[PDB]
Write a protein that binds this DNA or RNA. Structure first.
Ligand SMILES: [K+]
Ligand SMILES: [K+]
Ligand SMILES: [K+]
Ligand SMILES: [K+]
Ligand SMILES: [Mg+2]
Ligand SMILES: [Mg+2]
Ligand SMILES: [Mg+2]
Ligand SMILES: [Mg+2]
Ligand SMILES: [Mg+2]
Ligand SMILES: [Mg+2]
Ligand SMILES: [Mg+2]
Ligand SMILES: [Mg+2]
Ligand SMILES: [Mg+2]
Ligand SMILES: [Mg+2]
Ligand SMILES: [Mg+2]
Ligand SMILES: [Mg+2]
Ligand SMILES: [Mg+2]
Ligand SMILES: [Mg+2]
Ligand SMILES: [Mg+2]
Ligand SMILES: [Mg+2]
Ligand SMILES: [Mg+2]
Lengths: 263, 186, 229, 80
RNA sequence: GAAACUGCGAAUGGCUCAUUAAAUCAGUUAUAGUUUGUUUGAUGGUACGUACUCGGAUAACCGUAGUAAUUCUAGAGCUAAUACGUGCAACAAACCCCGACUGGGCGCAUUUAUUAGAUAUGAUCCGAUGAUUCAUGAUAACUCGACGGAUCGCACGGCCGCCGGCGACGCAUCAUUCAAAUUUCUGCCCUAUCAACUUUCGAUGGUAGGAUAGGGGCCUACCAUGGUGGUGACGGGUGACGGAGAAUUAGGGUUCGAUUCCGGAGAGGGAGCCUGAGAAACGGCUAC
């Protein structure tokens, strides 16, 4: 009340952190970092609860202190560091370069990308204005800021950003006909192609997207993330990429029963 | 202490509002600086929210005043306070606040005018070949020029002395000046 | 009224207790930092002058410099000032304590005197006992200021004051010496050069990026050959 | 005139004593000019605000106040 | 490596529901009206008018004590800094002014004023919003400017003394994250045996200031007479913290909601305040 809060109750944790209700009174509060602490997956919830590498809040530390975790091309030790979207969690030694992608149910998935594809990432772009001494800068959506950007780059764009030599390799503008993945709300994790953008003077830029399998859905100007030019994404999607409503999930379970086992 | 809450005020319906909490620090107030025009300058540092610093000027004698028409800013000493829009006892007490009319000596401005326009009021070839160019458009208001002989120019304070610790301002000209002259003449 | 006599030059402290009113009247209106002649307060103090710089009441309450005629008053003292210590208190925390004014009177149970003038008559105690201390200063410039030295003649080979002779309980002779705290080594110069090199790297990168962005805008101007060609 | 108080009323950051001409200078409020702005949201600035002599720092068109938030329609109740 | 100095934390958590009936609170807004230790990314040329590295203290320690007394307290002698305080800031360019006939300014920060930020001499650069004199640039000056590394670890190397790596801590600006503060609209139980309430002394509005991190009668001077009300103001009761929710439920509904999740408020009752990025803090102080 008189200041900041350093505790996060388990029942107050974000939903995509599927945490057992009777597992404790507290959840790991995400540290300050590049991502918004509600759309992030802390490292504690990576070496635990997603991989069986660590078993407690004592071996996550025991393997972070060995400097074994390299997120976004940099060794990180803070166990509650907020890896939030498409961050390259590159585990050295064993080589587990993982892109944090959005499951069709709003979850977080560690898509195992190849090593040479793990040397870059992509970032969404916030406003672009003039800095001190009249030097334009980028100010992406994951805390990153890049000075001297190419003048074609504008707001809401996406940039393919290198890691070892941090410079913009190329970029995709925000326009209709581009692959887009939704990263917020109920439509999280659904890829599609923008059909038209509707503009309301004052607020609420609404984007209408067409799914590959024929479905259509709308969302805000936020929560969307351009992925690739035209209809070809620049990254490997985890699987499915379609909403897959409950009935067809039941059908998949049925055919899994009727095949494979089939007995 | 002094607070800025609406807690003690009354509703727009004229009904008394009760109290459900104590006073809070983040809504405090402080005593006014009550800056004075005096020769013994004194400015005291204040520590404000966030750890930043406010400069509370208790006494000032000089200032940074700008002639907008010629766009020249000079440091000069204030001589008197002649008008105060809000309170008529703030000129009797000679209190430096924003929008308070003051008088500043014209010596720096006379010196700049002489060395720039080549004209005194109140070298081989380049300087003379450039001086008449500035003398071609040289024009001054009669009310502006009549104060150089007197040695003091009417001016207005645009800074907040109790906040920035300084008294800067601009020289009164045009439609402003006579409006105050008709208020200062008697 | 007990007196704590301290020989600051090279001596020690001692307690002198006297009770006769005539001798203890001369120091009955003086204040802190006032001089008192030794003869007036008694014999054996001919060439001696004492300075008043302390004293406690009959209840242990201290004497605070700057307060008027002796009378117990209450002051809102700050931490770390005389007559108020910290030792487990919040940083910006004050406290109201009880002090007495610097004026000396009969309401004092002890008074601290320091010897200013050596005099000529000895005192058994704080006149012959010569004692060492910890090491001389461990700073670099405070060695060359103690052994008179020039710019050269490094102080590394100058610690003759090894505090030896602390013979170990296992019958082992080990020596202890401090560590110089401002000595210039090649490491410090390396750090200075590293800082300079970092500044050079920043100054180079800035102009490199500016030149490349100027080239990019030149290419954009070449692209502007398509608005109307 | 518009000056009906014990202080001169002027538009901030609008120099009223420049010797150079006007009436053709962009951003009205330059080289001596009434300062006015469009509030956006599809609202038209009245001609009485552009070609006006009043001074109002709380006016949305020729003042220091920007319109953002909620837009509400209603009827005037009391204008005294 | 004990102790001690220095830094950081103790403003989270825990407990309770007394006050509080458009007030807290819920959904939904706004900051173009602000502050933000910290985390992440980027960015630090002007000191010049001993730099192979400046100065004085002080704790632990040791020894003289006072008091019935307490992490009550006074003297003496030593000694450190990433404590405190000074000071080379190491080496530029561009530009703005005053100017020798054919020199001063200028890092970053602060305050004020002027000015560019266009339309949309043939060939002709110039961001952003629904919306700004906006982002930013140039200019004139201003400030007694806690700013612009006198700091630590590991590894040792390459050039004739020169140069050099990987880290730690620290200062400043911007963006981000963690947040708060204030704020838009709508919504609450019973009572008319509560019908007018508020305003000279702030009640509603205006002008100019003061104060605040910042908007605002938040406060001051002057001015105007306004503001709410049978669509229940004002006043009273509550054995009234608000919500998510609980019980019973054909449907509708009725009753409850101190309590583990969110928000608010309190540390016996009021008030004032220091430190700190953050408190009107009470396992902090001062007073009654
Ligand atoms: K603290
Ligand atoms: K609300
Ligand atoms: K305010
Ligand atoms: K602190
Ligand atoms: Mg908006
Ligand atoms: Mg400590
Ligand atoms: Mg709490
Ligand atoms: Mg009531
Ligand atoms: Mg309301
Ligand atoms: Mg601007
Ligand atoms: Mg105001
Ligand atoms: Mg009044
Ligand atoms: Mg109650
Ligand atoms: Mg409740
Ligand atoms: Mg209980
Ligand atoms: Mg609670
Ligand atoms: Mg409280
Ligand atoms: Mg009790
Ligand atoms: Mg309290
Ligand atoms: Mg307690
Ligand atoms: Mg507490």
């Amino acid at each position: 009340a008189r200041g900041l809060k350093k505790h996060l109750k388990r029942l107050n944790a974000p939903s995509h952190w599927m945490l057992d209700k009777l597992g404790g009174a507290f959840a790991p509060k995400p540290s300050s970092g590049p991502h918004k602490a509600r759309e992030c997956l802390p490292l504690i919830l990576i070496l635990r609860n997603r991989l069986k590498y660590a078993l407690t809040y004592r071996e996550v530390q025991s393997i972070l202190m060995q400097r074994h975790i390299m997120v976004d091309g940099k060794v990180r030790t803070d166990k509650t560091y907020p890896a939030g979207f498409m961050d390259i969690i590159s585990i050295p030694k064993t080589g587990e370069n993982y892109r944090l992608l959005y499951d069709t149910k709003g979850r977080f998935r560690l898509h195992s990308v190849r090593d040479e594809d793990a040397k870059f990432k992509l970032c969404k772009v916030r406003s672009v204005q003039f800095g001190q001494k009249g030097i334009p800068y980028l100010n992406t959506y994951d805390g990153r800021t890049i000075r001297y950007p190419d003048p074609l780059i504008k707001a809401n764009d996406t940039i393919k950003l290198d890691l070892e030599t941090n410079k913009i390799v190329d970029f995709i503008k925000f326009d209709v006909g581009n692959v887009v993945m939704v990263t917020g709300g109920r439509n999280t994790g659904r890829v599609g192609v923008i059909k038209n953008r509707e503009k309301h003077k004052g607020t609420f830029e609404t984007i209408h997207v067409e799914d590959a399998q024929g479905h259509q859905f709308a969302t805000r100007l936020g929560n969307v993330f351009t992925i690739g030019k035209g209809t070809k994404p620049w990254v490997s999607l985890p699987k499915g990429k379609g909403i897959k409503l409950t009935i067809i999930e039941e059908q998949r379970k049925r055919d899994a029963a009727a095949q494979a086992a089939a007995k | 202490g002094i607070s800025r809450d609406s807690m003690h005020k009354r509703r727009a319906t004229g009904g008394k509002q009760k109290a459900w909490r104590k006073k809070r620090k983040y809504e405090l107030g402080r005593q006014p600086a009550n800056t004075k025009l005096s020769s013994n300058k004194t400015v005291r540092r204040v520590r404000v929210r966030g750890g930043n610093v406010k400069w509370r000027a208790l006494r000032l004698d000089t200032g940074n005043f700008s002639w907008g028409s010629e766009a020249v800013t000079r440091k000069t000493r204030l001589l008197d306070v002649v008008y105060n829009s809000s309170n008529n006892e703030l000129v009797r007490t000679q209190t430096l606040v924003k929008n308070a009319i003051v008088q500043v000596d014209a010596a720096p401005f006379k010196q700049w005018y002489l060395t720039h326009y080549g004209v005194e009021i109140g070298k081989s070839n380049n300087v003379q070949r450039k001086l008449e160019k500035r003398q071609q458009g040289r024009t001054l208001d009669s009310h502006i020029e009549e104060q150089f002989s007197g040695g003091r120019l009417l001016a207005c304070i645009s800074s907040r002395p109790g906040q920035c610790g300084r008294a800067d301002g601009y020289i009164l000209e045009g439609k402003e000046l006579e409006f105050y002259m008709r208020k200062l003449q008697k | 009224m007990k007196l704590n006599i301290a020989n600051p030059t090279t001596g020690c402290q001692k307690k002198v207790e006297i009770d006769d009113d005539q001798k203890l009247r001369n120091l009955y209106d003086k204040r802190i930092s006032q001089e008192v002649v030794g003869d007036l307060l008694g014999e054996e103090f001919k060439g001696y002058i004492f300075k008043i710089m302390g004293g406690c009441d009959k209840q242990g309450f201290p004497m605070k410099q700057g307060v008027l005629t002796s009378g117990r008053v209450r002051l809102l003292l700050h931490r770390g000032t005389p007559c108020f210590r910290g030792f487990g208190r919040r940083n910006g925390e004050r406290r109201r304590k009880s002090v007495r004014g610097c004026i000396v009177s009969q309401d004092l149970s002890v008074i601290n005197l320091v010897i200013v003038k050596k005099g000529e008559n000895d005192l058994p105690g704080l006149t012959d006992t010569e004692k060492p201390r910890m090491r001389g200063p461990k700073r670099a410039s405070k060695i060359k200021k103690l052994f008179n030295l020039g710019k050269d003649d490094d102080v590394r080979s100058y610690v003759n004051t090894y505090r030896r002779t602390f013979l170990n309980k296992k019958g082992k002779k080990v020596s202890k010496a401090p560590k110089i705290q401002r000595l210039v080594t090649p490491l410090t110069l390396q750090r200075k050069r590293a800082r300079i090199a970092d500044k050079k790297k920043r100054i180079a990168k800035k102009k490199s990026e500016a030149a490349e962005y100027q080239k990019l805008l030149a290419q954009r101007l070449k692209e502007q050959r398509d608005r109307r060609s | 005139a518009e000056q009906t108080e014990k202080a001169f009323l002027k538009q901030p950051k609008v120099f009223l004593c420049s010797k150079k001409t006007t009436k053709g200078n962009n951003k009205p409020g330059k080289e001596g000019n009434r300062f006015w702005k469009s509030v956006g949201l599809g609202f038209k600035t009245p001609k009485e605000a552009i070609e006006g002599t009043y001074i109002d720092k709380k006016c949305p068109f020729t003042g220091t106040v920007s319109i953002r938030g909620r837009i509400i329609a209603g009827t005037c109740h009391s204008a005294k």
